[PDB]
């Protein structure tokens, strides 16, 4: 019994004695001589109102023009970014609402939350009326992201310290990701779609075969909870935010360490991160009611979206990277470009 | 300048504008109550008594007052990542079993020390809690086969089902850091016919009176 | 989805008439309703529209302030209240669906029809041809032609394709003049620019054979072309 502890220690061992062993550059020390980015000013081009409560996440459509935002009240709203009219206003079961998707097809929107059940929701249907596609029901810890592969199947990040890859048309998991030693917090898929990323308040980051069905790598380096993960547009990199204050870019060949985004004065956590179209910018959301743009490559703090009155909780870049939306607990979401 | 259906749907927008703006009054002239306690203590049976695979959600209608009471306890996962959910209610109805010293690994002092996490919650510093005491009828006894220092050793000065409720009272009362922003109210259930809904409704309207209270600066 | 519709009959001049639309199988309070007619052997042409939630109504000069357009949602229908009528109301009055959100299918579907027989600045829009011949298997392109150019600022061309088959009501192939309506066998396609657009259609074969109708929906009142018949 013992002995298996020791050796899972010196193969952990190993595994840090080959990860120093490959940091033969720091990222600073070869992206200080590019010309910084400049202080990037950003207004808030529209204001999109009507929640009544916190927002708690949002996605955005392929098209970079609709965007799905979900809140406590019990309701899912499909903003049009250009006009910042109602497309649609799904109300929900459970009010306790922990995050939504959009499918890149644009067809269905998912939610989920405490009820631990991901609910899909139906918008191209001839009655008119979004109503519920399917629940996928399984999971035994609330719901933190989710995220559509494909019109057919998803995939669910719970708190449960499990993440699964659920088939839509049969309504039950065909593949189950174990390996956690806490609950998952955050997940996205890769640019390809095969292989996905979570993170967990075990302070650790994962990355998943979605077709092999098991991990393939772990990152660590955080001193608390995960909160947040978004892949870096290359599909090599991710971004995690954290409660620490501190986000990090991890890069999965290298496999360790790439970065550390943070600064003195910024002593609270990370609810949520994204990058920009080309990586450059990456653009985290903190519990000190602003969001933070980070130049992702000399990690300086480029700029600052100060215009929320609460916590800002949510954060999107459009596809093509016209704008950057921001959703926070005072209940309005802002569009800045 | 707006095109043909353009206006359309800015009509539409309008119109979901005011069916939101509907719901969200109805959805604020809810009372909302978070409920927390050990599954021993008798929450079950006073959510039961009351009511006349995550969250579970209860509506009550008493006296033109609908209560929402959000049993949460099925939700064996992390907290403090899913507790600010209920920033914004109302009150936390917390039920702890008199007769707590049966499990020693005792189970009165994690009750204590839940009562400290929970009343102290940075979360929670405006939002009241209702203490139900239960199991009075058997603990009535259950003191008499032995004293509170077993659990307390300064205990009840005469060791009565009086003075020791009230003991017990006065010890998860001063857990509270705030007793300005906060008011603890505390029931004995005693499986009681009915009394806990009223008991409940009394310190709810009592919590919405100060409430309003405090908005409009009388207090 | 269904709407079906009566009312019609015949009626001397002068007189009055209630056409009804019952609608079902669809959410009918969030949609807006038109109701357009067809002449008993010429095109079709637009008479009157209610937006969802009675908030707003329009009306063909032609009928203005002598149609009333009503609607109940508590009982999903549509009322069409005609006084006075004369010998050019004669015709088929169809209950047509329309539904306005970002990216939406207006004038999706359309009601069987409601016969009415009595008893003895818009935009100008054209066809090319009143009726062509055509030889299953092939392909064969429908012009049409605008007054005014549709292309709203916004980019949106708002022209819409009809399809009527013989003795069935017409069914939307096209909207926004590039967009394919569901359902469709997808060969149509359409394309085009402000006052000149077409419709092509690749591999032609059965049930395409029909009047095909041309529709602008920039301004109202919405102008239907004369149609273009595809006969073998």
């Known amino acids: 019994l013992d002995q298996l502890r020791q050796e899972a220690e010196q193969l952990k061992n190993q595994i840090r004695d080959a990860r120093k062993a490959c940091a033969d550059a720091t990222l600073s020390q070869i992206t200080n001589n590019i010309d910084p980015v400049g202080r990037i000013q950003m207004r808030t081009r529209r204001t999109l109102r009507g929640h009544l409560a916190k927002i708690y996440a949002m996605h955005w459509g392929t098209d970079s023009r609709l965007l799905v935002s979900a809140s406590q009240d019990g309701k899912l709203i499909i903003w049009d970014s250009y006009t910042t009219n109602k497309v649609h206003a799904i109300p929900l079961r459970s009010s306790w609402v922990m995050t939504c998707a959009y499918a890149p097809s644009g067809n269905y929107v998912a939610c989920g939350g405490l009820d631990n059940i991901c609910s899909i929701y139906n918008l191209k249907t001839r009655e008119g009326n979004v109503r519920v596609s399917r629940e996928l029901a399984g999971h035994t810890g609330y719901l933190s992201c989710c995220r559509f592969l494909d019109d057919n199947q998803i995939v669910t990040s719970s708190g449960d310290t499990t993440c699964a890859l659920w088939d839509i048309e049969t309504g039950q998991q065909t593949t189950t990701f174990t390996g956690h030693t806490g609950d998952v917090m955050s997940l996205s898929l890769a640019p390809d779609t095969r292989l996905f990323v979570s993170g967990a308040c075990d302070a650790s980051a994962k990355l998943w075969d979605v077709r092999e069905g098991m991990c393939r790598q772990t990152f660590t380096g955080h001193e608390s909870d995960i909160n947040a993960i978004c892949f870096f547009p290359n599909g090599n990199a991710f971004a995690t935010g954290s409660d620490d204050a501190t986000c990090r870019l991890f890069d999965l060949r290298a496999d360790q360490e790439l970065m550390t985004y943070s600064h003195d004065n910024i002593i609270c956590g990370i609810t949520s991160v994204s990058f920009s179209k080309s990586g450059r910018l990456l653009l985290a959301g903190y519990d000190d009611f602003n969001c933070n743009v980070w130049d992702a490559l000399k990690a300086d703090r480029a700029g600052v979206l100060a215009g929320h009155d609460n916590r800002v909780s949510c954060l999107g870049v459009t596809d093509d990277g016209m704008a950057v939306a921001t959703g926070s607990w005072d209940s309005f979401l802002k569009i800045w470009n | 300048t707006l095109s043909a259906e353009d206006k359309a749907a800015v009509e539409r927008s309008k119109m979901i504008d005011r069916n939101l703006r509907e719901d969200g009054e109805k959805a604020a002239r809810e009372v909302k109550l978070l409920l927390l306690g050990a599954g021993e203590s008798g929450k079950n049976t006073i959510v039961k008594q009351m009511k006349i695979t995550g969250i579970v959600e209860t509506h009550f209608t008493f006296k033109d007052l609908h209560f929402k009471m959000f049993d949460v306890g099925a939700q064996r996962s992390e907290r403090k990542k899913w507790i600010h959910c209920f920033e914004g209610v109302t009150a936390i109805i917390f039920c702890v079993a008199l007769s707590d010293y049966d499990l020693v690994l005792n189970r009165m002092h994690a009750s204590m020390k839940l009562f400290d996490s929970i009343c102290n919650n940075k979360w929670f510093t405006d939002t009241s809690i209702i203490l139900f005491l239960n199991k009075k009828d058997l603990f009535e006894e259950k003191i008499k086969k032995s004293p509170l220092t077993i659990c307390y050793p300064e205990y009840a000065g005469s060791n009565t089902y009086e003075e020791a409720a009230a003991y017990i009272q006065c010890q998860f009362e001063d857990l509270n850091k705030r007793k300005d922003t906060k008011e603890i109210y505390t029931h004995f259930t005693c499986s009681t016919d009915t009394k806990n809904v009223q008991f409940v409704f009394d310190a709810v309207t009592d919590v919405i009176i100060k409430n309003n209270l405090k908005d409009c600066g009388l207090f | 989805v269904q709407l079906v519709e009566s009312g019609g009959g015949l009626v001397q001049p002068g007189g009055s008439r209630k056409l009804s639309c019952s609608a079902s199988?669809?959410?009918?309070?969030?949609?807006?309703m038109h109701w357009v007619r067809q002449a008993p052997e010429k095109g079709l042409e637009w008479v009157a529209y209610?937006?969802?939630?009675?908030?707003?109504?329009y009306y063909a000069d032609t009928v203005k302030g002598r149609f009333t357009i009503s609607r109940d949602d508590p009982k999903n229908t549509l009322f069409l209240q005609m006084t006075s009528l004369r010998s050019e109301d004669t015709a088929m009055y169809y209950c047509?669906?329309?539904?306005?959100?970002?990216?939406?299918?207006?004038?999706?579907?359309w009601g069987q029809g409601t016969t009415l027989t009595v008893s003895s600045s818009d935009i100008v829009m054209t066809q090319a041809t009143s009726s062509v011949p055509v030889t299953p298997g092939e392909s064969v392109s429908i012009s049409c032609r605008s007054s005014?150019?549709?292309?709203?600022?916004?980019?949106?061309?708002?022209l819409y394709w009809f399809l009527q088959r013989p003795g069935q009501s017409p069914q939307l192939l096209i909207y926004?003049?590039?967009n394919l309506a569901s359902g469709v066998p997808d060969r149509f396609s359409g394309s085009g620019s402000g006052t000149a657009f077409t419709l092509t259609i690749s591999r032609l074969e059965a049930e395409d054979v029909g009047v095909y109708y041309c529709?602008?929906?920039?301004?109202?009142?919405?102008?239907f072309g004369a149609g273009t018949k595809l006969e073998l």
């Open positions: 047509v669906r329309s539904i306005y959100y970002y990216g939406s299918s207006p004038f999706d579907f």
């Open positions: 926004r003049m590039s």
């Open positions: 529709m602008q929906h920039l301004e109202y009142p919405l102008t």
């Open positions: 199988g669809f959410a009918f309070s969030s949609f807006g």
């Open positions: 005014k150019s549709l292309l709203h600022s916004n980019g949106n061309t708002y």
């Open positions: 209610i937006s969802s939630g009675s908030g707003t109504i």
